[PDB]
Amino acid sequence: LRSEQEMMDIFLDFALNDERIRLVTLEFQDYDISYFVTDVESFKENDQWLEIFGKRIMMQKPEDMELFPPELGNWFSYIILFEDGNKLDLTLIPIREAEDYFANKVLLDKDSFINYKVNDRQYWIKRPTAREFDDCCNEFWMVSTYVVKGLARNEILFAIDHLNEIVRPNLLRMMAWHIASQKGYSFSMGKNYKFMKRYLSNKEWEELMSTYSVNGYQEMWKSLFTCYALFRKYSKAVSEGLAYKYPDYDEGITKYTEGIYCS
Template structure:
């Protein structure tokens, strides 16, 4: 696998030798001083260019990066463009996700000077790599503060508790109907997600809301106490309904423990009535 220096040398040299490129900057985890370094990190690169069409029409300018073994483009069906609502305005910005045969990955985009000035493709994780025309903004050192866990309002806390127990009723219904796809998808999309929101608030409350849990909460193991993380692991069931029901019990236990602590930190009351409503529903439908 090529080293980080080798990759950056190629990225910068490619920009330097192409007259269409005005500047280039780094985004993402490699620009984040708080992220542990490893060989799996993407190189999130944006080139500021005179126009985007020629880059889309002929992608041979990517050849110096190496042999691509898997690629996804912004306008691919079911791809990241659809997920993030980016399937438009290709004359202003366009991007590619590239995986190379040595295991390195570059997520690279091109944007016009006007688009760069608008700042729609960047945040505070911004690190200039090359600026041939002096067009890049002078910004403070990169920081991930935009992604810190935010302290919830009481309304948000109550809403999270309500959604957790309300959506768990649908999961129970799916199990009773033997509708595994519905039950499992609902479980992860709604109540399990609400648990993760609550766990994020717990981490925030212990760190004065000054850390990020990372994309898809990938730093939970780093920030959660070991006993809490071990319980969290048990909330991931397999396709066995017996194991699924056990996971739901653990889910409810962990959610309640975390929610009570967050309620105390916010100076509000844990909504017992939501939990009791779920328990009564479960008992009523399971006794039929």
């Protein structure tokens, strides 16, 4: 079967662990993937490393055929028809040719040498600038007050939509920026943050999981405060690592929602 989720995980996960793969790009359910690598010939040694993607019905290597001359420059691709029914089209482009390529949807960049494209900038993650950093905190805490007012005014649905759509998503960006700090990579969270489980450790996923709680007004306050706790943690971690000023939004809003939560 293998859902579009499971398939993407495999390709993204593969690239992440392979040191020759520096950049990954995307584009019927067919998959169009491109790995920009350091040593193209390395992959060409043999076809064992391909077994990781699963059992296949058959495969075609367009630039390695006698009957059909190769004419895809320095590329080398594979067309695979998987047993589960999925079809993949994987191209191996030399990393040195990324610039040319770009010029005339990136998923992962391990070096970030080049600068480039974007309604997807919503999911794009890379080292924040002092300003971008401040922006994430500004939005987080500000929209956060909407959730407070929602719960205090009996508009739990109003509160829930802002929590799900803005507050938690910014906590995630903050966490992604932290991960990006470790490695120094740039990547996408994917449509609806679908790739985040593939970046967070199990501890970090459990923390994010803990921001979800069953229905109820009090359960909501809990979810919100949990996001608070985690946002401080990661924004402090990030601000500290890049030497950016820690905002005062935390403190200001903490006093605020505390004022309303109690009295």
